[PDB]
Amino acid sequence: YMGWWGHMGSPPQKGIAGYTISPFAARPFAGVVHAAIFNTFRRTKNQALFVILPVSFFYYVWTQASEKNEWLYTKAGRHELAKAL
Amino acid sequence: PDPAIALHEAAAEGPCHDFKHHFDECVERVTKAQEAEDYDHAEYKEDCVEEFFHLQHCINDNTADKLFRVL
Amino acid sequence: MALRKKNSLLNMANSYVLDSPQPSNLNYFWNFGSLLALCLVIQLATGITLAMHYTSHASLAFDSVEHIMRDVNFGWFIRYAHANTASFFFICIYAHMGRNIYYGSYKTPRVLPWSIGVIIFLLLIITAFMGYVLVFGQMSLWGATVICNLVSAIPWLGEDIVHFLWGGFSVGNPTLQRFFALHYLMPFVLAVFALLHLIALHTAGSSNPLGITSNVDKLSMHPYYSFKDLITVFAFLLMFTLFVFFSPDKLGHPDNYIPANPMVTPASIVPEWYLLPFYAILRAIPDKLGGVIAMVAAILILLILPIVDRSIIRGNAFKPISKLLFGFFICNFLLLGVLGQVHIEPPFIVLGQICTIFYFSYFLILLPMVSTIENIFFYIGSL
Amino acid sequence: MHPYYSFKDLITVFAFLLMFTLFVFFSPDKLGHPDNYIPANPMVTPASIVPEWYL
Amino acid sequence: ATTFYNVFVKRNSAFVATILASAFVFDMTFETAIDNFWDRINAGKQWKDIRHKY
Amino acid sequence: MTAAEHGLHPAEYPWPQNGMLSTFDHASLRRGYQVYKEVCAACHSLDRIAWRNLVGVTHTTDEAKAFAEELEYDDEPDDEGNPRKRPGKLADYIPGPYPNEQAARAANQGALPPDLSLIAKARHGGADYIFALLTGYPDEPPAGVVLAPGMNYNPYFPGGGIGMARTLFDGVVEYEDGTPATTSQMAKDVAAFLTWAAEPEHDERKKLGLKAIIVISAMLGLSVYIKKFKWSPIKNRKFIYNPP
Amino acid sequence: NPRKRPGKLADYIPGPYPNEQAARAANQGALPPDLSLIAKARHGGADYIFALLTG
Amino acid sequence: TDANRLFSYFMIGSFGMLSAAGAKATVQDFLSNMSASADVLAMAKVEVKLGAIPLGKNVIIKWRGKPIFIRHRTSEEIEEANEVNVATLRDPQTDDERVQKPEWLVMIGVCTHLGCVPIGEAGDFGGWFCPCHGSHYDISGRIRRGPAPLNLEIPEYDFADAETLVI
Amino acid sequence: ASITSVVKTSELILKSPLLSKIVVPLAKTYVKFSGYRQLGFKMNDLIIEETPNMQLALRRLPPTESYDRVYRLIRATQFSLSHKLATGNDITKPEEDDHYLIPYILDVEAEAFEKDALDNLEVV
């Protein structure tokens, strides 16, 4: 499923003209400030839910579990601990 | 004299007064309970370790930096 | 013809590091492969150097490690480098595996590199476990004891196999000397399998974040990915520097600075952090043999991803529901890690069981269902 | 290469294993130096210091 | 700039010689600089600072 | 587990060596050695430290040779093969108070005082735990705690009952530099000294780390420029498509 | 305090001298070698031992 | 422009320069692990007093496992040693070549033949006699009679003080 | 899963009034959030092609459709490496998201599956 240069396995290409300029002719950091602020904001905003929802859920679960565990091993939690074991 | 003695006393009377009271109340209860007979044949004997820990943790929070400043 | 193409030896290097045709759009998560190669090189260099100063005999082992720390020139650095790079190796391998699962790298035609990859991961676990025993501190001994006793669960012959592994009736000098020899060997075996999975991959080439063919638009591996790999190499070396020079013991257990004592049992016997999720899965099953099977199954079940993923599309970039499920799967795997090092107490016992069910149900139920439904949504939604 | 040289290699493998067996089981120390059964002593110098035969 | 390019950069042999010579200088001067800076931020703490009492 | 079973967690004290760029205070190290030698060394060994290790850290060559030369060490047997003693050398390890574990336990009501050479790394908390433990013996155990015989209450120790009694009291040591030897001061000095004993490479390690951080950061910045420079023809590429 | 016990099957056969110095003092400076490997540590083996003792 | 190219080669060059300096530092610090460790360097250089040693006596100091004979030679002993014509000596040396101080014969006390330790004061040249094959050493510890090829080796020693030598 | 499977199941749903009423709006939202149109792709451009059946279907595309697919893949690869999204006419509009490849792959699979059946025929 992959060939090599000259016979890579692409369907025939026709009608595309590609253009580019030399690394020495270009400013490598052109538009960097716009990218760093606006592009990153857009990319991050669009993926935020996929991180926030699972992280926040599993952090909540952990927090509840660790707080209960802590309470069961106090004096106040003696009776509830006895039942739990 | 040990600088810690005064710093700890100050922190107990001041920022850690609520914790100091709880420890005090606890000790009063436990001592009184030990005084009562048939304490040795009781199921649950209370200590004051928890209250002590809450107080010491508090004193340490209010003292650690001050103490090392005078050494 | 250029020499790099004509000469058969040069041409093999050329095919993998220079003219190798890559997709033009690999993102930074395609950099973990070269980071793993870097970890492997650091572990070989530091490991062979430690072997020149380490003594495998149980009477001298722990002290030889102290001699390395105290007397050998730069011994402290070589030892801390070796111990911390073991953790970095696992961070990079989890990242590399997470990349592979998110982007569908296990799908045809890449089932073979993925399957060899699963064995690489098993070899890394064994390598790291044996290396940790070599210190012969308290965690070394007691970790060896409890992990090696899992073999006792094998029916009929289990106890015999344990005594055979130990070379005696408990973890002692014979065990330590054989672990040294095997710990030295296993990284070479690991390097061979790492090479095998790359040769297997070379038939299809790298996948890419869009999940489509890159045969239409290839870039040479050098100079583009050579220079892009340097960025993450230097980022890695910065993280390495912060641990090795400023916090060399953050990822370790203080009990491993107490010499092994078969009499005193440490407060809590836990594996190194990177093995903790598998330990939580084992605890979840009450049966001894059941727990061992579940724990091994948790790794071998990776082999069925090519089958249970029913999607007509490779990878998750365009699959919102799959992306949510993957997020929950990953966070669950981290929670299992945390539960691996809590005490066996309420309510963590039940939570560990629920997380273990979620772990397996991802492979067996959720991924097959979600991938089926997404197929239908793509088709109906684009009509 | 297979099957012709696979089966021709088996002959010399078994011839080698016969020579191996004669040394390992019947004369295990013939190719060695007796002085290597004395523990290293930086003080005493052996009568003659020679490399192994192949060097 | 032409001159500088022509002397130190154009021939790779010269470029590599310049890089290596610079690395040698960097190494020696950086060592001295860090040593002094380290001694200033950790003043009165190090053995070299209390040695004179003994 | 109950908090008592864990032990109270020590405060974070501001040690001189806390800080990416900070060495130990060597004057504190020297004072801490004197606390070790006059108090701890009665029960605790420091077996991983040789006299040469003190030199140029806490003591001069001559001071450390003098400490070594006051002791007797086992020599090689004489010509009739009878045992002999020799005076100590810089290469010798600091000798411990007891010949074996059994002797150590017999002197300490069954408890074995650990070797202190790695104790700062072998306990969660490090210097803070050592300082908290040494200074954390309350005059009276909290009401209700029943100590096993020969145990002392200390909240920092897991379980609360430690076989080591309080040993630091105001003026048990007379420091040679005139520092007031209060309980707190001695605990701070000895904790610093023990930290050094666990990790004697500490000062060099952090300076080499500073050099590494600087070089690696610069290399990271340059590698970003070079990557962007090399990639710009790919990033800047444009297409015109005329469908055939 | 030090203690002695009776020997067990696992114990090694004890030698006549506590150290080399004692051994040499008893043998006019010479150190009699340990005999556990002497048949392999000398050219001749059994023949050398027999020839030496009877020669 | 040349300025344009030169800038990008300055960045490339700086990166190559820091990589060279970093590699050099890495290699040097790392490989130094193979040089003698601190415990090994401590076992070299034995220091010995000289105040304790009376005239007409020979000490035995262990140094790198090997015994060191230190003799505090008398005037007449030095004289006895300076007599033998250098010409007739398996290993031709005068005491002045051997000692850096005529009153301190410092030698590695293992016989140059096979490696027994010579019994001092005995001999036939009244210095040292190896009992093993009967080789006789002098008051310079020069070989005079017997199978031994060389004179008893001299370690590298210096008088730090006039009362202490380091070996 | 086979394209045949996906197409048949989809047709069962599209038949059922109830099912279509609840599934079609979900499927449309799914496609909007999927975001492949924002890289100028058509849905069928995303189907895994490294299969004998898919390689055969792609070889049967009319030359025009095949040239246009190559351009969409190249264009999407350029957006991906640049971390940009399509704008303007490069965004695939819902009316342009045509199933150009589905009929070819359905024919290839029809034959492949009939061959499998007929390889297992039993003369009665």
Ligand code: HEC
């Ligand atoms: C005369 C006895 C004695 C003296 C003096 C003494 N210790 Fe101890 N120490 C002990 C014993 C016994 C233990 C073991 C206690 C136990 O495990 O219950 C101990 C334990 C410790 C521990 C470890 C506690 C733990 O977490 O296991 C540290 C640290 C310690 N000592 C430091 C010191 C320092 C620092 C000094 C003095 C500056 C000191 N000790 C003085 C007897 C002593």
Ligand code: HEM
């Ligand atoms: C994948 C490669 C490797 C991994 C993941 C690895 C992992 C480990 C780990 C986790 C330890 C415990 C470290 C500690 O806490 O002190 C260790 C110790 C050790 N490893 Fe490795 N290792 C690897 C390769 C090697 C190799 C190739 C050698 C060659 C001999 C080696 C030699 C040692 C030695 C001697 C020790 C004990 C001394 C010490 O603890 O530092 N390792 N290894």
Ligand code: HEM
């Ligand atoms: C020593 C450990 C390993 C090393 C050095 C290593 C190295 C690499 C490298 C260099 C590549 C090509 C570049 C890249 O995509 O990052 C790669 C690709 C791959 N590796 Fe690994 N790998 C290792 C472990 C693993 C493991 C444990 C797995 C699977 C469980 C795995 C599965 C793969 C797959 C499927 C690919 C192809 C990904 C793609 O390009 O789409 N590897 N590996």
Ligand SMILES: CCCCCCCCCCCCO[C@@H]1O[C@H](CO)[C@@H](O[C@H]2O[C@H](CO)[C@@H](O)[C@H](O)[C@H]2O)[C@H](O)[C@H]1O
């Ligand atoms: C990544 C570590 C760097 C070392 C490289 C690994 C060493 C071992 C690799 C050799 C295994 C054989 O690997 C195989 O070699 C040949 C030529 O080299 C490659 O062949 C490829 O390149 C050559 C020209 O470059 C073409 O003739 C051929 O059509 C193409 O497929 C195979 O795609 C590769 O799979």
Ligand SMILES: CCCCCCCCCCCCO[C@@H]1O[C@H](CO)[C@@H](O[C@H]2O[C@H](CO)[C@@H](O)[C@H](O)[C@H]2O)[C@H](O)[C@H]1O
């Ligand atoms: C492929 C390699 C080719 C051959 C190269 C040979 C390299 C092997 C030589 C080892 C050289 C070590 O030489 C010695 O190094 C250490 C650092 O390691 C230096 O030591 C110096 O810096 C270190 C930290 O880097 C400090 O701990 C030390 O106090 C200071 O003196 C010595 O000043 C130097 O004399």
Ligand code: FES
């Ligand atoms: S051994 Fe000294 S004389 Fe032969």
